[PDB]
Amino acid sequence: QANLMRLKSDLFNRSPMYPGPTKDDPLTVTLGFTLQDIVKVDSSTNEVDLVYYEQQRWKLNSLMWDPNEYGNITDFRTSAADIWTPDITAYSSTRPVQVLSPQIAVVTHDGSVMFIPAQRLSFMCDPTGVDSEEGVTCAVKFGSWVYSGFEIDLKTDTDQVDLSSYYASSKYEILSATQTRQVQHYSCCPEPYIDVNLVVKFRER
Amino acid sequence: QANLMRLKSDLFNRSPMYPGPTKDDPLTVTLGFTLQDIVKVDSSTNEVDLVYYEQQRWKLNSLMWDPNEYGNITDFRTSAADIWTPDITAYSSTRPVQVLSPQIAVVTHDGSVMFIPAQRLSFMCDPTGVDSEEGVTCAVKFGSWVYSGFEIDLKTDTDQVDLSSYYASSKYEILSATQTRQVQHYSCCPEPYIDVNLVVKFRERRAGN
Amino acid sequence: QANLMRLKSDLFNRSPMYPGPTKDDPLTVTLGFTLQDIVKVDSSTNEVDLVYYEQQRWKLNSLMWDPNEYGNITDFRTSAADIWTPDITAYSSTRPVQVLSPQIAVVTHDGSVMFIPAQRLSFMCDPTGVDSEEGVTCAVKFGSWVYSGFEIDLKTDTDQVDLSSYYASSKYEILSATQTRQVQHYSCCPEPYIDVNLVVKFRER
Amino acid sequence: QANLMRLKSDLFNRSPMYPGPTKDDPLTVTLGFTLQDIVKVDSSTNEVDLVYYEQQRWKLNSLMWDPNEYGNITDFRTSAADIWTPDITAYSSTRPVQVLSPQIAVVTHDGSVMFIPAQRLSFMCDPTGVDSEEGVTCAVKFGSWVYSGFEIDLKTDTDQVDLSSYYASSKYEILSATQTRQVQHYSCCPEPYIDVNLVVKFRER
Amino acid sequence: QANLMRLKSDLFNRSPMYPGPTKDDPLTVTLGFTLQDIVKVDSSTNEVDLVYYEQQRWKLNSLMWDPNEYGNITDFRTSAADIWTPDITAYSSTRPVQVLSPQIAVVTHDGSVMFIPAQRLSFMCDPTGVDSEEGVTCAVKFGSWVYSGFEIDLKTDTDQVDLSSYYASSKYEILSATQTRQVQHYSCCPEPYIDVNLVVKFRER
Ligand SMILES: NC(=O)c1ccnc(-c2cc([C@H]3C[C@@H]4CC[C@H]3N4)cnc2F)c1
Ligand SMILES: NC(=O)c1ccnc(-c2cc([C@H]3C[C@@H]4CC[C@H]3N4)cnc2F)c1
Ligand SMILES: NC(=O)c1ccnc(-c2cc([C@H]3C[C@@H]4CC[C@H]3N4)cnc2F)c1
Ligand SMILES: NC(=O)c1ccnc(-c2cc([C@H]3C[C@@H]4CC[C@H]3N4)cnc2F)c1
Ligand SMILES: NC(=O)c1ccnc(-c2cc([C@H]3C[C@@H]4CC[C@H]3N4)cnc2F)c1
Ligand SMILES: *[C@@H]1O[C@H](CO)[C@@H](O)[C@H](O)[C@H]1NC(C)=O
Ligand SMILES: *[C@@H]1O[C@H](CO)[C@@H](O)[C@H](O)[C@H]1NC(C)=O
Ligand SMILES: *[C@@H]1O[C@H](CO)[C@@H](O)[C@H](O)[C@H]1NC(C)=O
Ligand SMILES: *[C@@H]1O[C@H](CO)[C@@H](O)[C@H](O)[C@H]1NC(C)=O
Ligand SMILES: *[C@@H]1O[C@H](CO)[C@@H](O)[C@H](O)[C@H]1NC(C)=O
């Protein structure tokens, strides 16, 4: 306890909070999705509801420490309110995202952070034809809302969405699910924005 | 990090928060809408649900800095809780507005602020006739709830709503969408209030016009 | 900015918050309603939903200032969390009231406060017969929940509810709408309570 | 204002908050219900929704003062967040209770507190037969969640629920409504727990 | 009051908060479920809703005290916000868990904590066949979201779920209900995670 209390006090009480990335100190966030369930489709409003969790990884110099000076602590758990987290947002949501897990991240001595929130998302998707053999395809982009590619870049480790925890008795079966980096331009702003495009093809079981 | 931490500490820890605009220091907020989806209509209650984002821009002297004194930082991102934001309100809403994006603004060295919240709004609109070729027209006013035209004025850069991100498989297609400055008077108060009137003409998606 | 910052600092940082009215320093709150819409009726539960705004006015000595000493500032806007507000409550609500506007009041140099929240209220009302020519009448009382007439009195400026912003394409038309001061006695307490009774007569358009 | 500000500062800024009752300093809470409406029944889930208010009374030595020393103030209103309140809980609820009134209590110079929150509760009840002449009977227990009878005892002043504000045009009429002290034993714990059992018999009007 | 105020001040005002368990100071949490009601099933989305309470027990050295030094106080009640609590999470939920009881724990002089929150959970379950004699079986895992088996281990005192408070007029009757410790591995992480698997077999009454 003593060494960890001392480490946390040294990282968080002694400086002002990290103010987020900049053009001079940019950041790369690694994203990956694990799809648990397509819970429902609403064919009268063209909304689909997914339950998933989203692995987020990044690295800050200001969260580094030497394990020898703190009892060989190599990592610790801390509330996501104590640290900066990237503002990753679904670009075609129709309701606020619901949080289904504790908001706690793991920080490692090299300054790397892992944060894996479980979420339920309603987003824009036409499910017409879901009851056929071909199924339907829907897509949603995840990216920073306010940081361009000059401050936050994104990447994936794989283009395959993890389906190994997909609920076996869902109403819908997944035919494929990919996650792919893209670059976009928007009217407000001259700078390129990065997102990961989650594309899911599914049909009634 | 160091220069930005120092800049933020100088802007926010050294004074009391900006107390908002006044008759002597009025403010102009620029509004623009980007309509993403008409999600549903309820014909039994005359409520329609929109998903959009609303570009807000304004400028304060108290957020100015000289970039040379702070490592050539020209702008930064900060939580919308750290700064004053205008109290722009839909005047015919029937539910609290739902927030669909992080509440983070960008402040620039000249004191200008950009803030672009994504929202879902339920508002008063009669959708009778939406299933015809002509469609229906609905309107909603956005303005300050508590500041008159003497403290907050509004403008748009264009009268055309941005429809280039409108969801192509929505149940409803947009025939037109405008955003226009107006002046109103209300019973409580002799002072004029300014709003931007969002007028949308739409109909059910069909196979031909 | 400077003069207003100084005024606000003098009113709010230098004293403990106003502790509310008492038997020795009673308060009169003026109420007025502006009815925007009867949104729906539920005939299976006898609940009706109104959207309105409620003008509240009161006056405290502790919010007085001399304009000459503060750059001729005659009034200012401040968050409703910074000041005391009266605990005006609907007496036959069936759900928490939903807030549809910013919670910001205007304070004037004589100590007077204006606060005009927009609300959606579900309350107890039998809509049977709403589809006839005579329509139906419903009523809801608004008053302080915890202050009797000895600490908070209420009044209206007019007995006519403002209908000049009533939604012209509502499903329901208003035949009449009044707002009237009343005195009530309740089981808990010997002291009289004051309310304003909002009576609305309406029918299907 | 001055005397009340001074009294409140003396009661709340000068000590740590009251830490709640104990085996050595037990507390008796008096409960009484005023039933306003049975709003709806759901026969597919066996849930019923009540709107009521719950009178709570208790007495602490640490809230005593001498009126002579504070301008003859005999009582005052304060936010329920400023004082300890008993953790009275419905034992068969199916949703979080909704709060329908301001959370403000009245403290009297002898240390006695009155607190009367309005609530909407969904609880477990089979409404099958509600459309007959005999109606149905349902029951819900209210008591402390975490304090046994050794720290919190309950009582009522009467076994009759107050029905004098019951909504006259409710879908349901009340045939009877009682509130009765009981003792219960639970699996977790050898100590007796006290509750007040609210028993309501009703049918369709 | 005095001795308890002093004890609480000594435990909570004098140190930084306990930072949670680590590889060097691991923790065992004991879990047990008391099932109150299966409230509803949704056969169009494969979601089932349970109301239960979850007994949690653990022990920290930093919450120890000597009763002789504090008036023979052997335990006390405190808000769950004042102490660390384990991040026990349902692994197949489809909505945020609703809290149905006060969040108050009991701390004992040996450093042991008991915490028994009431909850409503929607989780993934196919109710097809619930209207037959055989019924249906559903399962949900509860465990730490962010701590592996190296920091948090779990156990049960019994494998039988407590059914002695199960609502007798529920739409569904319970045929069996077990709670069993398991070890799992997940894609993100090489370390084993521990859960308690709640398996319920039920049918229409
Ligand atoms: N200099 C600036 O003020 C600036 C520069 C780059 N991005 C933004 C920005 C951008 C966005 C938009 C970009 C994407 C699409 C809509 C919204 N998310 C939102 N909020 C923002 F503040 C603002
Ligand atoms: N000096 C004053 O007391 C004063 C002067 C101008 N406007 C307001 C005001 C006005 C409003 C209304 C104006 C529009 C229509 C309803 C609401 N928004 C709300 N809150 C307000 F405080 C108050
Ligand atoms: N001396 C006292 O303790 C006292 C004197 C006057 N009114 C209240 C009171 C009254 C109320 C009720 C009175 C009306 C009807 C229900 C609720 N509003 C609620 N909370 C209250 F505290 C308490
Ligand atoms: N010494 C102890 O640890 C102890 C002694 C007595 N009651 C509880 C307790 C009891 C309860 C249960 C008692 C009733 C039934 C379920 C829940 N409310 C909840 N929270 C609790 F902490 C704990
Ligand atoms: N060294 C690390 O960064 C580390 C080590 C072990 N577990 C996690 C972790 C793990 C999880 C997942 C593990 C299980 C399955 C999904 C979620 N709960 C969530 N958040 C986490 F932080 C992180
Ligand atoms: C690192 O590990 C060893 C125990 O294996 C021990 O010397 C010491 O606890 C650690 N280093 C410190 C405290 O500096
Ligand atoms: C700021 O710009 C000037 C040149 O205009 C130069 O001194 C330097 O490269 C910049 N400073 C930093 C800290 O980037
Ligand atoms: C305030 O009012 C007086 C007029 O009575 C004037 O002389 C003074 O300059 C004014 N100050 C302002 C507007 O700042
Ligand atoms: C309190 O009552 C007594 C009269 O019996 C009086 O001496 C005292 O001044 C009173 N205080 C007031 C009214 O503030
Ligand atoms: C503490 O010890 C016992 C209870 O086990 C009690 O009889 C005694 O009065 C207490 N003494 C003090 C000093 O509190």
XYZ file of C-alpha atoms in Angstrom, chain E:
205
model
C -21.318 9.809 19.027
C -18.015 11.274 20.315
C -16.032 8.044 20.196
C -17.403 7.096 16.756
C -16.700 10.590 15.322
C -13.158 10.269 16.644
C -12.739 6.746 15.197
C -14.006 7.832 11.775
C -11.796 10.900 11.802
C -8.790 8.689 12.678
C -9.524 6.145 9.907
C -10.428 8.543 7.062
C -9.002 12.075 7.611
C -5.439 11.042 8.579
C -4.308 8.989 5.552
C -4.680 8.972 1.747
C -7.406 6.517 0.646
C -6.522 2.820 0.278
C -5.329 2.507 -3.384
C -6.798 -0.995 -3.900
C -5.155 -4.415 -3.946
C -1.905 -5.347 -5.731
C 0.171 -8.440 -6.628
C 1.999 -8.059 -3.268
C -1.165 -7.393 -1.186
C -3.910 -9.432 -2.881
C -7.480 -9.625 -1.661
C -10.193 -12.271 -1.540
C -13.796 -11.096 -1.936
C -16.572 -13.428 -0.817
C -19.781 -13.180 -2.910
C -23.275 -14.524 -2.355
C -26.553 -13.861 -4.160
C -30.086 -13.592 -2.837
C -32.529 -13.716 -5.754
C -35.745 -11.713 -5.195
C -37.478 -11.736 -8.582
C -37.259 -12.494 -12.263
C -39.235 -9.430 -13.272
C -39.447 -9.893 -17.016
C -38.158 -11.628 -20.103
C -38.019 -10.045 -23.562
C -38.160 -12.783 -26.200
C -37.688 -10.322 -29.071
C -34.242 -9.149 -27.728
C -33.150 -12.089 -25.512
C -32.843 -9.958 -22.366
C -33.936 -11.034 -18.866
C -34.336 -8.730 -15.821
C -33.397 -9.874 -12.276
C -33.777 -8.171 -8.947
C -31.334 -9.484 -6.348
C -28.947 -8.512 -3.663
C -25.305 -9.319 -3.635
C -23.455 -9.889 -0.351
C -19.789 -8.762 -0.646
C -17.157 -9.376 2.069
C -13.473 -8.505 2.239
C -10.810 -7.536 4.838
C -8.179 -4.737 4.936
C -5.417 -4.150 7.536
C -5.831 -0.371 7.097
C -9.383 -0.497 8.553
C -8.303 -2.212 11.798
C -8.686 -0.545 15.186
C -8.484 -1.476 18.864
C -11.973 -1.194 20.442
C -10.536 -0.176 23.885
C -9.218 3.085 22.425
C -12.652 4.033 21.036
C -15.249 3.279 23.715
C -15.525 -0.442 22.794
C -16.922 0.260 19.308
C -16.707 -3.093 17.455
C -18.188 -1.920 14.133
C -19.818 0.978 12.327
C -21.841 1.947 9.282
C -20.348 4.224 6.680
C -21.167 5.413 3.178
C -19.610 3.194 0.479
C -18.152 6.381 -1.057
C -15.804 6.690 2.029
C -14.075 3.328 1.390
C -12.698 1.287 -1.468
C -15.139 -1.294 -2.861
C -14.438 -4.066 -5.334
C -15.411 -3.413 -9.016
C -17.607 -6.532 -9.359
C -19.324 -6.409 -12.766
C -21.851 -8.573 -14.614
C -20.136 -9.796 -17.808
C -23.220 -10.071 -20.066
C -25.304 -7.075 -19.014
C -27.199 -5.095 -21.660
C -27.970 -1.983 -19.578
C -26.369 -0.210 -16.645
C -27.221 -1.952 -13.371
C -29.806 -0.045 -11.326
C -29.104 0.498 -7.644
C -32.103 -0.286 -5.425
C -30.666 0.231 -1.944
C -28.539 2.757 -0.002
C -24.807 2.356 -0.623
C -23.691 1.876 2.947
C -21.256 -0.727 4.252
C -20.482 -2.052 7.715
C -16.855 -2.057 8.844
C -15.736 -4.268 11.738
C -12.697 -3.722 14.087
C -10.699 -6.577 12.526
C -10.754 -4.678 9.194
C -13.543 -6.755 7.644
C -16.207 -5.096 5.483
C -19.697 -6.232 4.569
C -21.564 -4.533 1.714
C -24.954 -5.744 0.399
C -26.310 -3.705 -2.519
C -29.699 -4.470 -4.081
C -29.638 -4.396 -7.876
C -31.700 -4.752 -11.002
C -29.833 -6.282 -13.931
C -30.790 -6.786 -17.593
C -28.608 -9.504 -19.129
C -28.314 -11.787 -22.164
C -30.610 -14.786 -21.964
C -32.833 -16.651 -24.450
C -36.209 -17.231 -22.739
C -37.633 -19.468 -25.558
C -39.331 -22.459 -23.869
C -39.922 -20.690 -20.553
C -43.626 -21.601 -20.874
C -42.913 -25.382 -20.819
C -42.438 -27.845 -17.936
C -38.652 -28.060 -18.467
C -38.166 -24.270 -18.467
C -34.953 -22.528 -19.515
C -31.491 -22.075 -18.110
C -29.588 -18.819 -18.096
C -26.248 -17.734 -16.756
C -24.308 -14.592 -15.960
C -20.728 -14.184 -14.700
C -19.828 -11.685 -11.976
C -16.221 -10.632 -11.448
C -13.751 -7.789 -11.330
C -13.542 -5.874 -14.585
C -9.935 -4.677 -14.163
C -8.218 -6.846 -11.536
C -6.938 -10.300 -12.474
C -6.679 -13.309 -10.163
C -3.261 -12.010 -9.012
C -4.951 -9.054 -7.203
C -8.554 -10.192 -6.570
C -9.667 -13.739 -5.936
C -13.336 -14.626 -5.321
C -15.089 -17.321 -3.373
C -18.553 -18.325 -2.238
C -19.594 -19.800 1.128
C -22.127 -22.066 -0.575
C -23.002 -22.981 -4.147
C -26.753 -22.536 -3.430
C -28.254 -19.158 -4.230
C -30.504 -17.958 -1.419
C -34.131 -18.308 -2.587
C -35.867 -17.812 0.764
C -36.927 -14.221 -0.117
C -37.973 -15.063 -3.708
C -41.241 -13.282 -4.537
C -43.992 -15.933 -4.203
C -46.239 -14.334 -6.880
C -43.559 -13.809 -9.506
C -44.534 -14.739 -13.051
C -41.582 -17.163 -12.965
C -40.703 -19.947 -10.541
C -37.138 -20.992 -9.876
C -36.281 -24.644 -10.395
C -32.662 -24.170 -9.360
C -30.093 -21.461 -8.766
C -26.383 -21.949 -8.229
C -23.335 -19.716 -7.766
C -19.949 -21.191 -8.672
C -16.362 -19.924 -8.807
C -14.656 -20.161 -12.250
C -11.383 -19.134 -13.887
C -11.433 -17.454 -17.344
C -8.914 -16.171 -19.891
C -9.645 -13.210 -22.183
C -8.041 -11.921 -25.421
C -6.547 -8.666 -24.032
C -4.526 -10.187 -21.236
C -2.502 -13.323 -20.349
C -3.537 -13.331 -16.644
C -6.436 -15.457 -15.325
C -9.615 -13.649 -14.225
C -11.909 -15.064 -11.536
C -15.706 -14.915 -11.607
C -18.749 -16.334 -9.868
C -21.175 -17.857 -12.387
C -24.837 -17.410 -11.449
C -26.881 -20.158 -13.177
C -30.679 -19.956 -12.891
C -33.189 -22.471 -14.208
C -36.757 -21.171 -14.329
C -40.186 -21.436 -15.941
C -43.560 -19.690 -16.025
C -45.650 -20.182 -12.870
